[PDB]
């Protein structure tokens, strides 16, 4: 009934049922967190790969009529895999946006219409091909789909200069609960506000986003400084807490703390000549000099940050991630500096069996210039840095220890991080923060508030009221979707 309704508008070769020969290949292709590549995983009954907006509209209308819910997938980077799976058995279809990957740049306006199914690498390469002096402030990882990324805000190495990806969105085309294709002018100001940081799924299927391409100099500078415990790593991380968020908006210094060492990784929007003087005046303790400097163009810095010197600009078009593993992730936000003595205690947790990495990104600058209520992303002024706890493993048999570590370090970090509410990042999805409760075919406000306030703070109420206007029947839902407030 649902399938026959789809064939009226969507070609059968773009439709995959569980019995289709290409089903397994199409489902598994973008499942990034391998712990979900199991038989226990609740898989969709149907997979739809649209190539036009009318196909998405048809899918929604067909879904309403035949009682089939839709979970949309772009790059599939969802940490908890909510774009391709369900926690409990329920009938659903997946709208896979991967074939809608157009990046159309308006050369004379420096704007771009980017499809949700395009990965960040497609966007980055597209901008580079059109101009050597233009860039865009999105994530580090090349395989992230624009759809889920922008929906949750999205940040990377350019956050201190230009904010989030969503801060630079000027228009968008969304398919709502009624199957209407709406732009900014047509969806209203609340609906447009909601998709710019309010998380994916909840407010409909965003087909494409119009973004503002921003300037970057012809040469940028990258440095990677590794520091062990005996070289003063604990002292350097302590000082960094106040120095990094206060540095000029052209400089971003991120930390990757693993085991016994702390890697200071940076991207400076300028040359080595100007960077050395800046570092010796603001953070001399790091021992940074011109030997650490790697000068290159902006586009060349994109594969350099996660793939090393081996990565090329052409590698950005590869749709397979360089990370092929089972993972558990959690996030925190620090508002007050953590004392040296306590950083010593945090570092002992990194040599514990099953330990992962702590990735720390400094805020301040351009990200902190936007008011807390301007976009649904509330981590602006007052935030010093974001912390991401990441663990990787092999096989479901070695899952017990690294999973326990993430929860263990999180419990320990409680007095040092943000409180009332304990702020978390939506794109760093964590179901341990709570899931929705469904009473009367609708997700409840009270259950949504638990995790909601963590991700969105005071912006949760407006997000819930907006959901009440667009989708009161709660058609677009998952375990962590915005509940309707009437």
Ligand X SMILES: *Cc1cc2c(nc3c(=O)[nH]c(=O)nc-3n2C[C@H](O)[C@H](O)[C@H](O)COP(=O)(O)OP(=O)(O)OC[C@H]2O[C@@H](n3cnc4c(N)ncnc43)[C@H](O)[C@@H]2O)c(*)c1C
Ligand Y SMILES: *[C@@H]1O[C@H](CO)[C@@H](O[C@@H]2O[C@H](CO)[C@@H](O)[C@H](O)[C@H]2NC(C)=O)[C@H](O)[C@H]1NC(C)=O
Ligand Z SMILES: *[C@@H]1O[C@H](CO)[C@@H](O)[C@H](O)[C@H]1NC(C)=O
Strand 69-73 versus strand 15-17 pairing type: unpaired
Which of ligand X, ligand Z, ligand Y, none does 162 bind, CB closer than 5 to 8 A by kind?
Answer: none
Q: Does 41 bind ligand Y (CB under 6 A)?
A: no
Q: Please give the residues from 175 up to 204 whose contact with ligand X meets the rule CB under 6 A.
A: 200-201
* CB closest to ligand Y, residue no: 54
Q: Does 230 bind ligand Z (CB under 6 A)?
A: no
The gap from C-alpha 96 to its chain's centroid, in whole angstroms, comes to 18
Whether the CA torsion 192, 44, 16, 66 is positive or negative: it is negative
The gap from C-alpha 455 to its chain's centroid, in whole angstroms, comes to 13
Q: Does 423 bind ligand X (CB under 6 A)?
A: no
Q: Does 225 bind ligand Y (CB under 6 A)?
A: no
Residue 427 marked as a ligand binder: yes
Q: Min. distance of Cβ 395 from ligand X in angstroms?
A: 19
Residue 155 marked as a ligand binder: yes
Which of ligand Y, ligand X, ligand Z, none does 307 bind, CB closer than 5 to 8 A by kind?
Answer: none
Q: How far is 346 from 350, CA to CA, in rounded Å?
A: 7
Q: Does 289 bind ligand Z (CB under 6 A)?
A: yes
Which of ligand X, ligand Y, ligand Z, none does 54 bind, CB closer than 5 to 8 A by kind?
Answer: ligand Y
Q: Does 93 bind ligand X (CB under 6 A)?
A: no
For helices 120-130 and 298-307, angle between their N-to-C axes, nearest 10 degrees: 150
Q: Does 86 bind ligand X (CB under 6 A)?
A: no
Q: How far is 324 from 398, CA to CA, in rounded Å?
A: 15
Instruction: Kindly tell me which residue out of 14, 28, 41, 54 binds ligand Y, with binding defined by CB under 6 A.
Output: 54
Which of ligand X, ligand Y, ligand Z, none does 289 bind, CB closer than 5 to 8 A by kind?
Answer: ligand Z
Select the span of 46-54, 197-205, 247-255, 276-284 touching ligand Y (CB under 6 A): 46-54
Select the span of 22-30, 47-55, 182-190, 345-353 touching ligand Y (CB under 6 A): 47-55
Site string for ligand Y, 164-203 (x = CB under 6 A): -----------------x----------------------
Q: Min. distance of Cβ 176 from ligand Y in angstroms?
A: 13
Residues found near ligand X in the complex (CB under 6 A)? 32, 71-79, 82-83, 97, 116, 139-141, 144-145, 147-149, 151-152, 154-156, 200-201, 205-206, 321, 323, 427-428, 478
Residues found near ligand Y in the complex (CB under 6 A)? 52-54, 57, 181
């Amino acid at each position: 009934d649902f399938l026959t309704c789809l064939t009226k508008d969507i070609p059968p070769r773009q439709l995959y049922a569980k019995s289709s020969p290409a089903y397994a290949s199409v489902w598994s292709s973008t499942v990034r967190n391998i712990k979900f590549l199991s038989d226990k995983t609740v898989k969709p009954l149907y997979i739809i790969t649209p190539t036009n907006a009318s196909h998405i509209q048809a899918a929604v209308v067909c879904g309403r009529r035949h009682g089939m819910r839709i979970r949309v997938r772009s790059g599939g980077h969802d940490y908890e895999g909510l774009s391709y799976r369900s926690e409990k058995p329920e009938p659903f279809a997946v709208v896979d946006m991967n074939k809608m990957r157009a990046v159309s740049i308006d050369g004379k306006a420096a704007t771009a219409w980017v499809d949700s199914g395009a990965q960040l690498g497609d966007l980055y390469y597209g901008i580079a091909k059109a101009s050597p002096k233009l860039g865009f402030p999105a994530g580090v990882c090349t395989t992230i789909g624009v759809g889920g990324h922008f929906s949750g805000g999205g940040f990377g190495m350019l956050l201190r200069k230009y904010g989030t990806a969503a801060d630079n969105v000027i228009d968008a085309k969304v398919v709502d609960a009624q199957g209407r294709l709406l732009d900014r002018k047509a969806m209203g100001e609340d609906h447009f506000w909601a998709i710019r940081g309010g998380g994916g799924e909840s407010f409909g299927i965003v087909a494409s986003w119009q973004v503002k391409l921003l300037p970057v100099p012809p040469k940028v500078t990258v440095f990677q400084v590794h520091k062990g415990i005996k070289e003063g790593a604990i002292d350097l991380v302590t000082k960094w807490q106040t120095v990094a968020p206060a540095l000029p908006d052209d400089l971003m210094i991120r930390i990757m703390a693993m085991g016994q060492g702390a890697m200071f990784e940076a991207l400076y929007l300028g040359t080595c000549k100007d960077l050395v003087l800046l570092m010796t005046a603001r953070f001399p303790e790091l021992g940074m000099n011109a030997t650490h400097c790697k000068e290159m163009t902006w586009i060349e810095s994109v594969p350099y940050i996660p793939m090393g010197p081996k990565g090329t600009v052409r590698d950005l078009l590869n749709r397979t991630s360089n990370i092929k593993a089972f993972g558990k992730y959690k996030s925190d936000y620090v508002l007050e500096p953590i004392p040296k003595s306590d950083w010593e205690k945090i570092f002992t947790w990194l040599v514990k069996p099953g330990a992962g990495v702590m990735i720390m990104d400094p805020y301040g600058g351009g990200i902190a210039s936007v008011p807390e209520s301007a976009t649904p992303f509330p981590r602006r002024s007052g935030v010093l840095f974001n912390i991401q706890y990441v663990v990787y493993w092999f096989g479901e048999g070695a899952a017990a220890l690294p999973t326990q570590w993430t929860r263990d370090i999180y419990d320990f970090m409680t007095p040092y991080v943000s409180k009332n509410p304990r702020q978390a990042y939506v794109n760093y999805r964590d179901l341990d923060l709570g899931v929705n409760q469904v009473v009367g075919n609708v997700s409840t406000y009270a259950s949504g508030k638990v995790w909601g306030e963590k991700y969105f703070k005071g912006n949760f109420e407006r997000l819930a009221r907006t959901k009440g206007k667009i989708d009161p029947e709660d058609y677009f839902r998952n375990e962590q979707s915005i509940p309707p407030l009437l």
